[PDB]
Amino acid sequence: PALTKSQTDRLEVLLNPKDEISLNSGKPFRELESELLSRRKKDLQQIYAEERENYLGKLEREITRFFVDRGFLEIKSPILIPLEYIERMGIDNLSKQIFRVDKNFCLRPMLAPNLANYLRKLDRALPDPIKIFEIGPCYRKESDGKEHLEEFTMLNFCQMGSGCTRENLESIITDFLNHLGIDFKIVGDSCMVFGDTLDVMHGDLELSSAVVGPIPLDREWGIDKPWIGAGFGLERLLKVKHDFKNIKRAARSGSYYNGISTNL
Amino acid sequence: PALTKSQTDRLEVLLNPKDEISLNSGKPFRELESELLSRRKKDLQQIYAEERENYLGKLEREITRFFVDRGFLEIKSPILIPLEYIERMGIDNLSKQIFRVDKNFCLRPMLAPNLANYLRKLDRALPDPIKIFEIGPCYRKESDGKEHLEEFTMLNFCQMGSGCTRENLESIITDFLNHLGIDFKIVGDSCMVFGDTLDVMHGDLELSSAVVGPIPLDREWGIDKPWIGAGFGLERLLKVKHDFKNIKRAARSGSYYNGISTNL
Numbered sequence: 361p362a363l364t365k366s367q368t369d370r371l372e373v374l375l376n377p378k379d380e381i382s383l384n385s386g387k388p389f390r391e392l393e394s395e396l397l398s399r400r401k402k403d404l405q406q407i408y409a410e411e412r413e414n415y416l417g418k419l420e421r422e423i424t425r426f427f428v429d430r431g432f433l434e435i436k437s438p439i440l441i442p443l444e445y446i447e448r449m450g451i452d453n454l455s456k457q458i459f460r461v462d463k464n465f466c467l468r469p470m471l472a473p474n475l476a477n478y479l480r481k482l483d484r485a486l487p488d489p490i491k492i493f494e495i496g497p498c499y500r501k502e503s504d505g506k507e508h509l510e511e512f513t514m515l516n517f518c519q520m521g522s523g524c525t526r527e528n529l530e531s532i533i534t535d536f537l538n539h540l541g542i543d544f545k546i547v548g549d550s551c552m553v554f555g556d557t558l559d560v561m562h563g564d565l566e567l568s569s570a571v572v573g574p575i576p577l578d579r580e581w582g583i584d585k586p587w588i589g590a591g592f593g594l595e596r597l598l599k600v601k602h603d604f605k606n607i608k609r610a611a612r613s614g615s616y617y618n619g620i621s622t623n624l
Numbered sequence: 625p626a627l628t629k630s631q632t633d634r635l636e637v638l639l640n641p642k643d644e645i646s647l648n649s650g651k652p653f654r655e656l657e658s659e660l661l662s663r664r665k666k667d668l669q670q671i672y673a674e675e676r677e678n679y680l681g682k683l684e685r686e687i688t689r690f691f692v693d694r695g696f697l698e699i700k701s702p703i704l705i706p707l708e709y710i711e712r713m714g715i716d717n718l719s720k721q722i723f724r725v726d727k728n729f730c731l732r733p734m735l736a737p738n739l740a741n742y743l744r745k746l747d748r749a750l751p752d753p754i755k756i757f758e759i760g761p762c763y764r765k766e767s768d769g770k771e772h773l774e775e776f777t778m779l780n781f782c783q784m785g786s787g788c789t790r791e792n793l794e795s796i797i798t799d800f801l802n803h804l805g806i807d808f809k810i811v812g813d814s815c816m817v818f819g820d821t822l823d824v825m826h827g828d829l830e831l832s833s834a835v836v837g838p839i840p841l842d843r844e845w846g847i848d849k850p851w852i853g854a855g856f857g858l859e860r861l862l863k864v865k866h867d868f869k870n871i872k873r874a875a876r877s878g879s880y881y882n883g884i885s886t887n888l
């Protein structure tokens with residue numbers, strides 16, 4: 361017998377990349393569902409008995425240790441930010457992707473504006489070079505795709521002062537992704553906010569956009585020294601590490617725990 | 625000479641609890657400001673040279689290790705949640721404290737609704753008892769006070785099944801606060817959502833509200849077993865640990881780093 365779209369969708373929810381199960385071999389839906397339910401219950405029971413850490417939380421902690429140990433200050437800045445930061449970043453009325461809150465606020469779509477404010481302020485107190493990073497939630501309205509979430513998690517690290525060359529930026533990216541065990545290439549791209557970017561690609565998947573300053577936008581943020589920085593999506597890193605078909609498996613969710621369906 | 629309100633406000637920004645400086649001793653504002661600026665620059669330089677971890681991030685990691693090691697599963701759930709969860713939690717049209725997003729969403733004011741969904745779903749797969757926790761941002765519109773932030777960080781841990789007694793709840797709270805070195809007492813209180821609470825107090829400062837289920841609200845969330853849980857504000861824990869006068873010192877902010885003014 362043949363499987364309906366609803367039946368295939370249910371089996372796909374329960375299927376994991378490590379499995380080797382053909383959904384349309386002729387085995388009835390009831391037995392495919394029962395087999396996958398048993399595998400997923402066993403997987404969740406093993407996590408509960410032996411590990412207990414959330415993939416997104418554990419990755420944030422691993423990344424934090426990497427950057428702290430390399431001399432970058434750990435930042436935790438507001439998620440709810442002034443709407444004025446949007447226009448000030450050069451997001452001309454992308455601007456359609458912004459989640460507005462009340463009338464003067466929004467959910468941050470990126471970490472860069474708050475990190476620019478920290479670079480400017482810390483430059484008055486700390487020795488050259490200034491090295492900082494932040495990991496946390498960012499928000500964009502997106503067309504539902506396999507690589508986009510509306511609520512995702514960004515890492516942005518950046519440096520201002522000496523050492524702010526393309527070669528040093530590439531070297532940090534290389535050390536970071538070598539630490540995570542992720543192969544990549546660098547390709548040029550461009551964006552409306554920062555201009556030319558160095559995009560870090562794993563196949564066709566964009567892991568990061570990186571920027572070598574100065575850029576004209578600097579003046580609007582009081583930045584007046586060379587700088588480099590890069591933004592990475594943590595859910596995309598997890599998608600690569602675990603071979604997930606859809607980025608939803610990696611997201612903050614009530615529907616998946618460490619890539620395992622919670623509808624069991 | 626006498627200090628103006630603006631001058632006193634500036635010195636208070638730069639003052640830290642460890643300092644022993646009288647603002648109205650007769651010393652001129654210029655010298656008090658210069659002394660405090662030097663102390664704060666030295667403090668920030670020491671953090672940058674030797675530690676580099678953000679207080680809120682470090683506390684979240686310490687708390688995460690405590691609960692993971694005691695058998696609780698680490699959850700990371702959505703911050704942007706359906707507005708329908710508000711009415712379903714019994715927040716009758718407090719409801720005025722909700723940050724609305726678009727027309728059907730809001731910023732979560734607490735972690736409990738997402739954790740209730742996880743308890744229900746995990747009970748179908750995991751052995752008794754189910755023990756989970758989450759740490760992350762929550763949002764409430766508040767009257768500007770010394771103990772309230774509009775963007776704050778909650779820990780909520782909870783357990784469902786066996787062991788869900790008042791004595792076990794108090795024992796977990798005691799072990800947790802003993803681990804952090806924070807003295808407390810338990811006092812009864814009540815709230816409109818959960819009914820009677822056990823409030824964990826440090827002096828007059830409410831560190832937590834805790835609940836022993838079942839409660840009538842359970843039916844609306846599909847919860848049908850005994851449960852216990854408690855919610856704690858991380859910024860309030862930091863305020864106690866570091867003797868901050870105002871909770872702003874502990875918050876996500878561009879204005880303070882580990883309680884040190886960034887306006888230097």
Ligand SMILES: Nc1ncnc2c1ncn2[C@@H]1O[C@H](COP(=O)(O)OP(=O)(O)OP(=O)(O)O)[C@@H](O)[C@H]1O
Binds near residue numbers: 509513
């Ligand atoms: N909606 C999203 N969901 C998940 N990750 C995202 C999303 N948007 C951006 N990212 C991640 O954040 C990084 C930096 O943000 P950036 O502004 O460069 O994204 P982007 O160029 O718009 O990405 P894309 O072209 O895939 O939409 C991206 O390289 C990606 O890893």
Ligand SMILES: Nc1ncnc2c1ncn2[C@@H]1O[C@H](COP(=O)(O)OP(=O)(O)OP(=O)(O)O)[C@@H](O)[C@H]1O
Binds near residue numbers: 831833857
């Ligand atoms: N606006 C806020 N800013 C900082 N922490 C908060 C805030 N609201 C709640 N908390 C923290 O979260 C815990 C659990 O939330 P709960 O709903 O019990 O707060 P609450 O009873 O409204 O607190 P309060 O009476 O001080 O307003 C509180 O005990 C407190 O530690």
Ligand SMILES: Nc1ccc(COC(=O)NCCCC[C@H](N)C(=O)O)cn1
Binds near residue numbers: 475554590591
């Ligand atoms: N003027 C300044 C100065 C310094 C910074 C520090 O921030 C950075 O390192 N940016 C790096 C690119 C991240 C990609 C981004 N998420 C985007 O939407 O393309 C910001 N602005």
Ligand SMILES: Nc1ccc(COC(=O)NCCCC[C@H](N)C(=O)O)cn1
Binds near residue numbers: 743835841
């Ligand atoms: N029906 C159910 C069942 C289980 C849970 C799990 O969540 C909890 O442990 N709550 C503990 C109290 C936290 C205080 C809260 N921030 C407030 O606003 O008073 C929730 N609901």
Ligand SMILES: [K+]
Binds near residue numbers: 377381
């Ligand atoms: K598979």
Ligand SMILES: [K+]
Binds near residue numbers: 504505506507509607
């Ligand atoms: K998606």
Ligand SMILES: [K+]
Binds near residue numbers: 512702
């Ligand atoms: K999400």
Ligand SMILES: [K+]
Binds near residue numbers: 641642643644
């Ligand atoms: K003082």
Ligand SMILES: [K+]
Binds near residue numbers: 770771772773871872
């Ligand atoms: K406040």
Ligand SMILES: [K+]
Binds near residue numbers: 438774776877
């Ligand atoms: K804040």
Ligand SMILES: [Mg+2]
């Ligand atoms: Mg995009």
Ligand SMILES: [Mg+2]
Binds near residue numbers: 566
């Ligand atoms: Mg792109």
Ligand SMILES: [Mg+2]
Binds near residue numbers: 557568569
């Ligand atoms: Mg990009």
Ligand SMILES: [Mg+2]
């Ligand atoms: Mg309150």
Ligand SMILES: [Mg+2]
Binds near residue numbers: 830
């Ligand atoms: Mg209260």
Ligand SMILES: [Mg+2]
Binds near residue numbers: 821823830832
């Ligand atoms: Mg309370």
